[PDB]
Structure 1
């Protein structure tokens, strides 16, 4: 079964604005973990915005879980997709409030489950005020890597069938990165996952990597196969980011 399909998608942000996505064709199997790489401004984040129907394409269709999103219930769509946001944990609010910031009636049990997958439960549990800890500075002083694991738990709490990782805007501490990489298979288990990767190394082990350039998918495949394509943009990017 395919959880996500783009057919002939053309998109621009405003009536006269430049075309940002052109003739995008992609079909992602249920449970696939996809990495999307490409230079800044290639259209990676825009592709994810369309999955959520934040914007409507001028040509083509997006189909989610088989449903054309034009026809799909927007409430159902919002429940199908969890997004790991960057730098979006609310400082003036508690950890649990941050994690359940979609369904405030969210069971403590559901919150802790999502926190365990995210690898946040352990550090939260060792805080004086636990889940009731106010995230904010002088209110506790959590790190960016701790906050990022909180952001993962938030994304996971409603058990989304599709999980999207927005591009990383900062480096996290070794501890937090280690916990996340160790827990990734648990976080992704049973879900279709899209990771927008600043560094190609991040998605070396994805089922498939999609390479975007100037709003088109130029290359797609497994890491080893993309490196086998003689003059591939993938290899070029791989070389550029290499030590």
Structure 2
């Protein structure tokens, strides 16, 4: 079963604007963990915007869990997709409010479960005010890596069938990265996962990597297979990021 399908997708942001995605064809199986890589502005984030129907393509179809998004319930779609946002933790609000910022009338139990998957529960639990701690500066002083785990918990809380990781915009402390990587298999378990990767190393072990260049998928496959294509863009990007 394919959880996400793009067929012949063409997209530009505005009527006059340049084509950003051109004839994208992609089929992602349920439970697959996919990495998306490529230079800045290749169209990686735009692809995920279309999955959420934030924009509508001028040609082609996006199908989510078999449903053409043209016809699909927008509320259902909102519930099927969880996005791990960058720099989106509200400082003026509690940790629990930040995690449940979609279904406010939801379980403390559901919040805790998501924070445990995210590897946040342990550090939250050792806070004077626990989950009621206000995130903000002089109000808690949570690190960027702590805030990122809260962001993961927020994405997981409603148990989405599809999980998307937006491209990393900063660097995380060793402890935060370590905890997340140790927990990735639990976070991704039972879900279709798309990771937009800043460093190719992040997604070395994804089921498949998709390589974008100038709005096109140019290459796709497992890491070892992409490195086997003699003049691949993947190999060049791999070389560039190497020590």
TM-score between the two structures when normalised by the length of structure 2 = 1.00
Q: Equivalents in 2 of 1:103, 1:12: separation in Å?
A: 32
Per-residue CA shift, 1:111-165, capped at 9, x if unaligned?
0000000000000000000000000000010000000000000000000000000
Per-residue CA shift, 1:188-242, capped at 9, x if unaligned?
0000000000000000000000000000000000000000000000000000000
Q: Equivalents in 1 of 2:140, 2:242: separation in Å?
A: 38
Task: Show the counterpart of 2:84.
Answer: 84
Per the TM alignment, residue 49 of structure 1 is displaced from its structure 2 partner at its CA by 0.0
Q: In structure 2, the residue corresponding to 1:179 is in which secondary structure?
A: helix
Q: Equivalents in 2 of 1:34, 1:182: separation in Å?
A: 18
Q: How well do the aligned residues superpose, as a CA RMSD in angstroms?
A: 0.2
Task: Show the counterpart of 1:209.
Answer: 209
Per the TM alignment, residue 106 of structure 1 is displaced from its structure 2 partner at its CA by 1.4
Equivalent residues, number: 243
Q: Equivalents in 2 of 1:106, 1:136: separation in Å?
A: 23
Unaligned runs of 5+ residues in structure 2 are none
Q: In structure 2, the residue corresponding to 1:230 is in which secondary structure?
A: coil
Q: Equivalents in 2 of 1:150, 1:115: separation in Å?
A: 7
Structure 1 segments of 4+ aligned residues over 2 angstroms from their partners: none
Q: Equivalents in 2 of 1:213, 1:105: separation in Å?
A: 43
Task: Show the counterpart of 2:99.
Answer: 99
Task: Show the counterpart of 2:8.
Answer: 8
